[PDB]
Design a binder for this molecule. Structure first.
Ligand SMILES: *CCC(=O)N1CCCC[C@@H](n2c(NC(=O)c3cccc(C(F)(F)F)c3)nc3cccc(C)c32)C1
Length: 287
C-alpha cells in the first residue's frame, strides 16, 4: 500500500490567459509561470458537490504520468475551480476520425490502438479502473500521438458502482447487470473504442436504446465487423467482448498484437487509397 507522493500545483489566476472557448466548459489558453521564460499552451476546464467531483478528478489526474495519459498541470482556485491541462490541439479522437475519415490510413489507426493500449496498461499498473474508455475520451495532441482523458468516473483499487449515469454500450456485461468494474471490464470498452475508430466514428448499436443492450449481449449478439477490418483485427475486438472476463485479452497483450500489425498495416486494414516565440509544450515542461 504505497504512499501517493504526487504533487498538486496551485496556480495563480494571473499566470494564464484564456484565449477562447473550445467547447461546452473548456478554453484554450496560455500559462506563463512567473519569471520562468516559458509559455505553455493549456486547456482550462472551468455547487459544493460539483467541486467535490472536479477535485476528485484532479486527484486522479495528478497521480498519473504517462505519455498516453492526459497530464494535469495544476488547478486554480477561484469562485469556480479550474483544472489546467495540456492543450490537445486536434480535439477528441471521435470527432477527428469523423472529420478526416477520408484521409486516415491504416497505420494511424493501428498506432492509435497501440497508444491507447499503452495508456490503459499503465492505468492498470497503477491499479486504476477508467470506467469511461471511449473514442470521445481519447484526445489528439498530434495525429501521431493520442492520450486517454476524462475519467471523472475513474476509481482506484472489482468495484461497485452506486448511482451514476453510465455509457452502457461501452460497458462490459457484468458492469451493466451487477455494477462490477475491473481492468477486464475496461478491456471491453477498449474493444468498443477500437470499433468506433475502425468505423470512423459510427455510433454503437445505433438506433437501439440502452434498455435492450443487456439482453442483446445475453443473446450472444455483438457489434458488426467493420468493412475495413480483416478477421485478424475483428477477432481481437470479439475477444474483448467475451462473457468470461478472464478470457478477454490483457492490455499488455493488446499492445503486442497491434504492434505486430502496425509493422505491416495494409495486411490488417483494407482502406481505399491508403497508398509566440518562447512556447513550450507541457510534455517538455517538468519540475
Ligand atoms: C469529443 C469532443 C472534443 O473534441 N473535446 C471535448 C471537450 C471540449 C474541448 C475539445 N478540444 C480540445 N480539448 C483539450 O484540449 C483538452 C485537454 C485536456 C483535457 C480536456 C478535457 F478533459 F476537458 F476534455 C480537453 N482541444 C481542441 C482543439 C480544437 C478543437 C476542439 C473542439 C478542442 C475536446
Amino acid at each position: 500500500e504505497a504512499p501517493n507522493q504526487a504533487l498538486l500545483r496551485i496556480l495563480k489566476e494571473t499566470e494564464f490567459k484564456k484565449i477562447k472557448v473550445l467547447g461546452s466548459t473548456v478554453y484554450k489558453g496560455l500559462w506563463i509561470p512567473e519569471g520562468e521564460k516559458v509559455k505553455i499552451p493549456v486547456a482550462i476546464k472551468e455547487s459544493p458537490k460539483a467541486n467535490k467531483e472536479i477535485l476528485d478528478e484532479a486527484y486522479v489526474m495528478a497521480s498519473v504520468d504517462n505519455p498516453h495519459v492526459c497530464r494535469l498541470l495544476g488547478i486554480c482556485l477561484t469562485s469556480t475551480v479550474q483544472l489546467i491541462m495540456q492543450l490537445m490541439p486536434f480535439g477528441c479522437l471521435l470527432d477527428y476520425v469523423r472529420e478526416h475519415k477520408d484521409n486516415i490510413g491504416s497505420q494511424y489507426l493501428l498506432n492509435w490502438c497501440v497508444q491507447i493500449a499503452k495508456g490503459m496498461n499503465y492505468l492498470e499498473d497503477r491499479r486504476l479502473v477508467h470506467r469511461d474508455l471511449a473514442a470521445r475520451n481519447v484526445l489528439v495532441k498530434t495525429p501521431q500521438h493520442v492520450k486517454i482523458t476524462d475519467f471523472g468516473l475513474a476509481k482506484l483499487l472489482e468495484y461497485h458502482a452506486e448511482g451514476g449515469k453510465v455509457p452502457i454500450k461501452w460497458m462490459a456485461l457484468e458492469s451493466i447487470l451487477h455494477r462490477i468494474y475491473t481492468h477486464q471490464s475496461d478491456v471491453w470498452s477498449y474493444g468498443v473504442t477500437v470499433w468506433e475508430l475502425m468505423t470512423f466514428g459510427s455510433k454503437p448499436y445505433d438506433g437501439i436504446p440502452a434498455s435492450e443492450i443487456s439482453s442483446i449481449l445475453e443473446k450472444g449478439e455483438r457489434l458488426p465487423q467493420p468493412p475495413i477490418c480483416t478477421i485478424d483485427v475483428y477477432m481481437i475486438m470479439v475477444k474483448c467482448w467475451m462473457i468470461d472476463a478472464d478470457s478477454r485479452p490483457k492490455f499488455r497483450e493488446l499492445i503486442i498484437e497491434f504492434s505486430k500489425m502496425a509493422r505491416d498495416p495494409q495486411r490488417y486494414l483494407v482502406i481505399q487509397g491508403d497508398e509566440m516565440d518562447d512556447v513550450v509544450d507541457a510534455d517538455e515542461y517538468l519540475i
